[PDB]
């Protein structure tokens, strides 16, 4: 029987957005990949005040947020016939205007909150730092290395929600040849990525990757190496990088269009103002070090710089994506035609176009590079090749069972000077590479 | 070429809820894991009579089922304005009240019907019974041992339905930068778990698990062991454990609320009375025996006693779950606002709140123990550890490719006196464990 013993930092009082040095000096004859606990805190936002019917206050990210007057369009200049505006809670509850402390912004964690935490890690022993890496290398490893079976539980370690399915009871159906009972299936999930008023404290169990900590026989001896000089440095993530604000207030619009079929259209538009986010502490953050008793196939990934840049409105869920993405919006309406006079009965006397408050956003990913050309001086390597070959067929036929087929066109496999022949040129291309595998 | 030969029981006339002794005396020089066929029968329920508008008959599980009068709430005491009640078939068809033989209760099999069949099995040869096991250890093995790839077909052996997907044709969408055609995907399924009026006869192909029947080289010789004294005992499940009743009658309630927007709300509530279920036989129940011609990592699971207890309303689909669960309900409505007078056009003249007959139930699972402490006398083992470590990281890093990552927080992995530090204390905790793996 073997037991893993913990260790505490010596610097003390960990803070977000600052460098932390941990000893891990000498505990264990042999050591392998470490585990770091991190217990987060509450994430309630600051109280805000409802706007006035004429307000046109400046918003965030350079986008103006307006509260239109009655009888106007979203802008306060062009007159629109039969437009009435009201304030509503994202859940549909009314919100009274002009009242102090009327609503609170929702707070939601960025996708994979535990992955952006280690933006930079250094493994060093009295200078001459042995190992460097960051978040992009971890993402590239995640998309390829870990098997698809060992996934769901791994999604719980980094604070990512997982989906659960429910049913809807029996339903009657017709069967065509040349009646039955069937059941419907729905998928839904909740967790850190779901915007909530008050976030339960998270528990990140972050895993550390190393070249010599993948096999028990590859561990370096502790006696030979200097035990007292080992000092692992970690750059904690910025407080503004993990959490984010979702609008806690909506400007409902109602319309009325004349003609033989009266049409009542209802639309929504968020009122987003960046408030103040409560400080989030990192308590009980020990590293449960696991202590026991006794050229090749190459990965690359291409990412637009806009994915990491703060100017991206959806930077919290596009940072890990390889390849520029677009948003597809499906707005579903609830039509209903009614007739009152039961004489002419030709066209609906009245109609309705009720629409949901929040749309359905699909992050469609598209290839960024039309062609690849890796022309090194020593070896010609690959030139004028399509992206689909290195994206799909190479992992399919090479790698074996450990490798998992890529899902995004940005990253690819080639079995250093690298060039591109893309058309979406904006000097935003950034490359990440792994060769030790 | 090798062919497997069958064998029939010697007791004869198998019955549900009684012990059956099967020979398997001597057929086969070497034998491995057995297979048992079981063909079930019809499951039509008994005819019942529609209630009267004032009836308040006693229901099942101690819950009163009422048919409220006009102008009252669900209870027959508090007056409610504008409430009208009617009887409806779960599929929406009207049901006339006070008519003899007016409806039939729906009959549906419990989740994994073939897994509860073998509530207890004994492997013995002239006394000194060699092997004992039951359903819970098989559930644990299913949740951990069998790979995720070998799943769908295995889901057909134990009579569990599998989902199928359909499409909805082209739809027009918008793409935002800095129009397209897309298709929607829906999932639905039918089978034994779907409540149906008449259940086709099932076909269970149940598999038997053993320590020495996992490898061909580990099979004990038949000549050395006593062939004539082998007698395998199986305790078949009770007839009330597999099948269950779903309400075949619903009490539709309609309302009307005065005001500027005149709403019309429709709600439903089941009328559930436990009828008589037709006897289900076990015919053609041969065992197609497979006959051919010639400390460590430990798995534990924690389950509330309410999961198995008959007092649980959803015991048929919670028995295999590890960890207490709750039910989340999304009731979807169909709003539609209409205006008649086209001269005010500010507040909707009328509204509708049509609701579905059956809600969408999500079985949300929650951890039962906030801490674990396994303190044995000989070895301290583990003490004061979080459940997330033994639930997620240990299977992720230990086990290899054979193990599958757990989905439920109740079960965990630890590489016998076991203690717990839970807060949901009700003397309902039950532990299952396996160590031979």
């Amino acid at each position, epitope marked *: 029987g073997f037991e893993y013993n913990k260790v505490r930092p010596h610097t003390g009082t960990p803070t977000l957005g600052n460098k932390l040095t941990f000893g891990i000096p000498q505990y264990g004859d042999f050591f392998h990949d470490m585990v770091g606990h991190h217990i987060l805190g509450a994430c309630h936002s600051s109280w805000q005040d409802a706007p006035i019917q*004429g307000t046109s206050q400046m918003g965030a990210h350079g986008q103006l947020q307006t509260f239109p*007057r*009655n009888g106007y369009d979203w802008d306060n200049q062009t007159p629109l016939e*039969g437009a009435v505006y009201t304030l509503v809670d994202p859940f549909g509850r009314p919100i009274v205007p002009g009242t102090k402390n009327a609503y609170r912004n929702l707070v939601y964690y960025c996708e994979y909150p535990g992955e952006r935490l280690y933006e930079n890690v250094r493994f060093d022993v009295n200078g001459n730092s042995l190992d460097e890496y960051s978040s992009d290398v971890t993402t590239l490893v995640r998309k390829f290395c870990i098997p698809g079976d060992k996934m769901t539980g791994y999604k719980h370690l980094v604070g990512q929600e997982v989906s659960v399915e429910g049913t809807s009871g029996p339903l009657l159906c017709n069967i065509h040849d040349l009646l039955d009972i069937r059941r419907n299936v729905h998928y839904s999930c909740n967790g850190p990525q779901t915007p909530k008023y008050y976030q339960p404290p998270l528990a990140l169990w972050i895993k550390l990757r190393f070249w010599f900590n993948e096999n028990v026989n590859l561990a370096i001896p502790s006696v030979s190496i200097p035990f007292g000089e080992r000092f692992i440095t970690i750059k904690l993530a910025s407080q503004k990088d993990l959490v984010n604000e979702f609008p806690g207030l909506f400007v409902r619009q109602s319309r009325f269009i004349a003609g033989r079929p009266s049409r009542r259209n209802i639309r929504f538009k968020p009122w987003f103002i960046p408030g103040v986010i409560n400080e989030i502490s990192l308590t009980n953050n020990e590293l449960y070090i696991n202590n026991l008793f006794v050229i090749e196939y190459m990965f690359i990934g291409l990412k637009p710089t806009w994915n990491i840049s703060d100017q991206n409105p959806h930077q919290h869920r596009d940072w890990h994506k390889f390849g520029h993405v677009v948003n597809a919006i499906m707005q579903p309406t609830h039509h209903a035609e009614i007739s009152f006079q039961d004489r002419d009965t030709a066209l609906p006397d009245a109609c309705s176009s009720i629409s949901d408050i929040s749309p359905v956003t699909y992050p469609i990913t598209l290839p960024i590079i039309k062609n690849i050309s890796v022309t090194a001086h020593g070896i010609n390597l690959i030139d004028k090749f399509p992206s689909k070959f290195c994206s799909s067929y190479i992992p399919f036929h090479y790698g074996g069972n450990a490798i998992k087929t890529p899902d995004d066109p940005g990253a690819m496999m080639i079995t250093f000077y690298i060039s591109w022949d893309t058309d979406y040129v904006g000097s935003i291309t950034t490359a990440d590479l792994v060769v030790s595998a | 070429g090798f062919e497997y030969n069958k064998v029939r029981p010697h007791t004869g006339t198998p019955t549900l809820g009684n012990k059956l002794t099967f020979g398997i005396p001597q057929y086969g020089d070497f034998f491995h894991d057995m297979v048992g066929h079981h063909i079930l029968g019809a499951c039509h329920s008994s005819w019942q009579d529609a209630p009267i508008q004032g009836t308040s008959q006693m229901g099942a599980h101690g819950q009163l089922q009422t048919f409220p009068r006009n102008g009252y709430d669900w209870d027959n005491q508090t007056p409610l304005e504008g409430a009208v009640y009617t009887l409806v078939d779960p599929f929406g068809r009207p049901i006339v009240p006070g008519t003899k033989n007016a409806y039939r209760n729906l009959v549906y099999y419990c989740e994994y019907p073939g897994e509860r069949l073998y509530e207890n099995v004994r492997f013995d040869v002239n006394g000194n019974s060699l092997d004992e096991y039951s359903s819970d250890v098989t559930t644990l093995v299913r949740k951990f041992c069998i790979p995720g790839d070998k799943m769908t077909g295995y889901k057909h052996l134990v009579g569990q339905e599998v989902s199928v997907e359909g499409t909805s044709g082209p739809l027009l969408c918008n793409i935002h930068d800095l129009l397209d055609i897309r298709r929607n995907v829906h999932y639905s399924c039918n089978g034994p778990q779907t409540p149906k009026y008449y259940q086709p006869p099932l076909a269970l192909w149940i598999k038997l698990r053993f320590w020495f029947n996992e490898n061909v080289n580990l099979a004990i010789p038949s000549v050395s062991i006593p062939f004539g004294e082998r007698f395998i005992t199986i305790k078949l499940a009770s007839q009330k454990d597999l099948v269950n009743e779903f309400p075949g009658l619903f009490v539709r309630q309609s309302r009307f609320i005065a005001g500027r927007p005149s709403r019309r709300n429709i709600r439903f509530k089941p009328w559930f009375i436990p009828g008589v279920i037709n006897e289900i036989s076990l015919t053609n129940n041969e065992l197609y025996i497979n006959n051919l011609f010639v400390i460590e990592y430990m798995f534990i699971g924690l389950k509330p006693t309410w999961n198995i207890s008959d007092q649980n309303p959803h015991q048929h689909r919670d028995w295999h779950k590890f960890g207490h669960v709750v039910n989340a309900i999304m009731q979807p409505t169909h709003h539609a606002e209409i205006s008649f007078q*086209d*001269r*005010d*056009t*500010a507040l909707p003249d009328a509204c509708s709140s049509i609701s579905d007959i059956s809600p969408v139930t999500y079985p949300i699972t929650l951890p039962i123990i906030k801490n674990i402490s396994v303190t044995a006398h000989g070895i301290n083992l583990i003490d004061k550890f979080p459940s997330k470590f033994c639930s997620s990281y240990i299977p992720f890093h230990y086990g290899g490719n054979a193990i599958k990552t757990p989905d439920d927080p109740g079960a965990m992995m630890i590489t016998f006196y076991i203690s717990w530090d839970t807060d949901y204390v009700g003397s309902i905790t039950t532990a299952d464990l396996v160590v031979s793996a």
Partner: antibody
Amino acid sequence: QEKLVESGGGLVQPGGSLILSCVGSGFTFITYEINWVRQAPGKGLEWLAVVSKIGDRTYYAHSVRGRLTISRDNSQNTAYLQMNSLRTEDTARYYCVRAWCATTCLPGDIMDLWGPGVGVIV
Amino acid sequence: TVIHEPAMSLSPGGTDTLTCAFSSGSITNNNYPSWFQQTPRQPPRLLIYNTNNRPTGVPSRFSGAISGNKAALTITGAQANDEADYFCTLYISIADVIFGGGTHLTVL
């Protein structure tokens, strides 16, 4: 600089017939309604009639219906109001006004750009 | 009918309030209060067409809301050019518009 001008007001014997003409400039008269508001001396203001955008529909008040005939002329952008069966109470100030359609549409809600008004006496 | 003040006075640079009320009932958003102004021998100018909305070109020193079941118009930082009249109008029934009396506001 949109302008509205009323004409046709003056001294008149009771029981006669009167025509009030409202003309506009600086704005598109096609896509706007025309309302007429009467203000009695030493009293409040009252609403009189409504004419639609293209004259298809019209409405009136309870105490003046049957004697008032509102009409439009979109050629040279002029609205007419014929009034008959004159009595002494008609002494007031009449204002031809424009209107948008927010919330309520036909009776008018916003009522931008009131005219100077014309005084009519018996 | 609509009840409104007969007369009202204000000192220069002060704050003034005006109230518009019903005979029997209360006042809510559905009534649609509207506040105008009428200087002598000039056309009336729209000030507050809904409860709190105002058109373009009107100085931002005007306000208005519903308080105490009345329509309230508040003027802050009034100048000496407000020697005019103020009246209230409301919307009842389905197509009924009722105007109110006028206040000859005076600045000392």
